[PDB]
Amino acid sequence: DLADRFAELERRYDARLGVYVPATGTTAAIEYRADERFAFCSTFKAPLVAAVLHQNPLTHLDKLITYTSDDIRSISPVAQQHVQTGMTIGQLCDAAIRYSDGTAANLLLADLGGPGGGTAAFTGYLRSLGDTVSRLDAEEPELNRDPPGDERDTTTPHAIALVLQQLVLGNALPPDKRALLTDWMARNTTGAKRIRAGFPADWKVIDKTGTGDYGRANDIAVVWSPTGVPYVVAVMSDRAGGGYDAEPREALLAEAATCVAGVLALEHH
Numbered sequence: 001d002l003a004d005r006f007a008e009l010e011r012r013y014d015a016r017l018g019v020y021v022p023a024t025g026t027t028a029a030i031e032y033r034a035d036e037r038f039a040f041c042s043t044f045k046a047p048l049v050a051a052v053l054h055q056n057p058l059t060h061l062d063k064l065i066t067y068t069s070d071d072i073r074s075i076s077p078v079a080q081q082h083v084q085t086g087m088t089i090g091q092l093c094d095a096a097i098r099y100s101d102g103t104a105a106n107l108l109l110a111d112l113g114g115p116g117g118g119t120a121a122f123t124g125y126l127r128s129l130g131d132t133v134s135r136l137d138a139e140e141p142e143l144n145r146d147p148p149g150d151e152r153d154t155t156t157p158h159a160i161a162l163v164l165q166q167l168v169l170g171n172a173l174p175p176d177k178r179a180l181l182t183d184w185m186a187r188n189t190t191g192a193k194r195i196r197a198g199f200p201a202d203w204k205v206i207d208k209t210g211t212g213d214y215g216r217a218n219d220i221a222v223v224w225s226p227t228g229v230p231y232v233v234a235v236m237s238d239r240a241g242g243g244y245d246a247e248p249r250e251a252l253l254a255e256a257a258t259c260v261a262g263v264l265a266l267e268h269h
Contacts, residue, residue: 005259006032013252015215018236020157021260022165026229027269030260035133037154038236041144041210043218044122044136044155045096045105046185050167051125052089052108053177061090061180065107074102074141097184097208102140109139129166133159144212148240160220161234168206168222169230182206185222193250194219195233198257200265202226215239215246219253223264231264233257 010017018038021030052060066086072079078095079087079102087095092108095101106118113121119136126134134155136143143153155163166172168182185206194217196205203223210218221233235253239246263269 002030002259002263003032006256009252009255009259013237013239013249014241015237015239015249015252017252017256018157018234019256019260020161020232020234021264022161022232024229024231027231027264030263031158034158035156037151037156038218038238039144039146039153039210039212039216040134040136040155040160041212041216041218042100042102042105043160043208043210043220044143045100045108046181046208046220047126047129047163047167048105048108048112048122049093049097049184050173050177050181051112051122052093053180054125054173055112056089058176061088061093063089065089065092065111067103067107071106072103074106076101076103079103079107093180094184097181098188098190100190100209100211106139126163129163129172131155131159131163134163144216145244148214148238157234157236160236161232164220164222164234165232169232182222191219191221194253195221195223195235195257197251197254198259199223199261203261203265211248213244213246215242215248217248217250217253219257221257223261225264233260235260 019032020034023029064086077099092104095104109118137152146152190209191207207221218236223231235256
């Protein structure tokens with residue numbers, strides 16, 4: 001069975017793997033270490049965007065945010081490009097999702113919660129969605145760097161899947177705001193070798209990745225069958241035996257996603 005396949009993925013990669021797929025009418029829940037904690041890493045940026053969308057009129061997306069090179073202390077492929085000219089809230093949401101931009105995420109955190117209140121405010125949005133388990137404690141880049149076992153900056157596969165579900169497939173956002181989120185995740189550039197790699201090409205995939213220290217590799221996704229049946233997939237991993245600088249393994253997540261796709265696609269299941 002499925003738990004055995006997942007277990008062998010852990011042995012071969014020298015990794016801890018977490019997987020959650022909520023049940024549907026047709027399919028049972030897929031759960032493997034689903035209530036164990038894993039670092040968000042960049043996966044937080046999906047609900048971060050939902051939060052800034054939710055708490056503001058859409059005209060707030062055209063608000064220009066100015067920042068300096070002092071603000072860039074994490075990997076920020078888009079923010080670095082726009083440091084001299086600024087970025088609109090919309091552009092930051094775009095960057096946070098599609099390029100995992102760390103500075104963009106930090107600025108969205110300050111927009112939501114103020115200079116020292118951002119992480120508390122983000123965590124609060126999640127509590128407003130019924131998630132009492134997840135927590136964001138630090139900003140980028142430190143949120144990626146807690147030791148294994150530290151509860152700070154963690155979610156679980158279970159909690160982040162259900163959060164994503166509400167955001168994309170539920171009513172947490174009104175339709176015009178929900179489209180924006182969904183459009184950005186659909187145009188993500190960092191996920192091709194993760195959940196995407198385990199699903200056939202006629203299945204639609206939108207995702208938000210995460211990577212960090214101790215070989216952290218995450219992906220959270222909404223998938224659609226060719227007939228448009230939706231599923232939510234969260235895969236999380238770390239490789240803490242190699243220490244702080246352990247190689248993250250994207251192919252661990254592609255394989256877990258292949259095991260999941262095998263269950264969801266093959267109609268004998």
